[PDB]
Scaffold this active site. Structure first.
Site, PDB file in Angstrom:
ATOM      1  CG  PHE A 195       2.373   8.548  -0.413  1.00 55.08           C
ATOM      2  CD1 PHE A 195       1.240   7.749  -0.716  1.00 55.08           C
ATOM      3  CD2 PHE A 195       2.710   9.464  -1.528  1.00 55.08           C
ATOM      4  CE1 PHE A 195       0.407   8.260  -1.536  1.00 55.08           C
ATOM      5  CE2 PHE A 195       1.858   9.748  -2.634  1.00 55.08           C
ATOM      6  CZ  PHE A 195       0.616   9.100  -2.663  1.00 55.08           C
ATOM      7  CG  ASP A 196       2.806   4.328   6.000  1.00 55.15           C
ATOM      8  OD1 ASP A 196       3.913   3.817   6.213  1.00 55.15           O
ATOM      9  OD2 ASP A 196       1.771   3.740   6.431  1.00 55.15           O
TER      10      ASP A 196
ATOM     11  CG  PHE B 254      -4.900   3.896   2.231  1.00 52.82           C
ATOM     12  CD1 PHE B 254      -5.965   4.536   2.992  1.00 52.82           C
ATOM     13  CD2 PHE B 254      -3.843   3.332   2.839  1.00 52.82           C
ATOM     14  CE1 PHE B 254      -5.652   4.756   4.190  1.00 52.82           C
ATOM     15  CE2 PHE B 254      -3.581   3.692   4.227  1.00 52.82           C
ATOM     16  CZ  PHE B 254      -4.648   4.089   4.985  1.00 52.82           C
TER      17      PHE B 254
ATOM     18  CE1 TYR C  80       0.942  -0.438   4.779  1.00 50.08           C
ATOM     19  CE2 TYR C  80       0.409   1.875   4.023  1.00 50.08           C
ATOM     20  CZ  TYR C  80       0.958   0.891   5.066  1.00 50.08           C
ATOM     21  OH  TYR C  80       1.555   1.054   6.328  1.00 50.08           O
TER      22      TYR C  80
END
Ligand code: A1INY
Length: 126
Positions: free
Chosen positions: A53-54, A116, A45
């Site tokens: 972003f993660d 996401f 993801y």
């Protein structure tokens, strides 16, 4: 770009039809099975607060969780349940299906909308 497109074009996959969780399929997956509650699920993801972003790729390994066991936010329990193996989807998530007006500091402020891209790699029954 992507979050706006999901606002404009995404399907509402909530039971309440409150546009809490909006989805676009970006790459079609294979098979008739979608995961069900209890399945161990493997994803990659990329997520962010919708205002920029993660990523699992940051940690060079897939993200694993058990579906519908409260291990992840409600919007993932709902969203990933709709995905086929190999599918890439975009989700846009209001706070009610994520971290609420309480938030989750320091990463998540109060009342945050989240975006996401999810790739469903695999899933296996408990
Ligand atoms: C609120 O805290 C975080 C939120 C999010 C990621 C967090 C996190 O710190 C625990 O850690 C990652 C940096 C490390 C990998 N990881 C993910 C999880 N556990 N460990 C699952 C989390 C316990 C809960 O996350 C979620 O339910 C969702 C969906 C699954 C992937 C991660 N999720 C997040 O909300 C991220 C968040 C996305 C928007 C940008 C900030 C990070």
């Amino acid at each position: 770009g992507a979050p706006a497109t999901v606002t404009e074009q995404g399907e509402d996959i909530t039971s309440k039809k409150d546009r809490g969780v909006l989805k676009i399929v970006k790459r079609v997956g294979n098979g008739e099975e979608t995961p069900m509650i209890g399945d161990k699920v493997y994803v990659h993801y990329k997520g962010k607060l919708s205002n920029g972003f993660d990523s699992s790729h940051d940690r060079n390994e897939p993200f694993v969780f058990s579906l519908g066991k409260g291990q992840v936010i409600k919007a993932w329990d709902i969203g990933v349940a709709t995905m086929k193996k190999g599918e890439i989807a975009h989700l846009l998530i209001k706070p009610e299906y994520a971290y609420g007006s309480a938030g989750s500091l320091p990463k998540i402020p109060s009342n945050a909308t989240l975006f996401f891209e999810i790739e469903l790699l695999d899933f296996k029954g408990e």
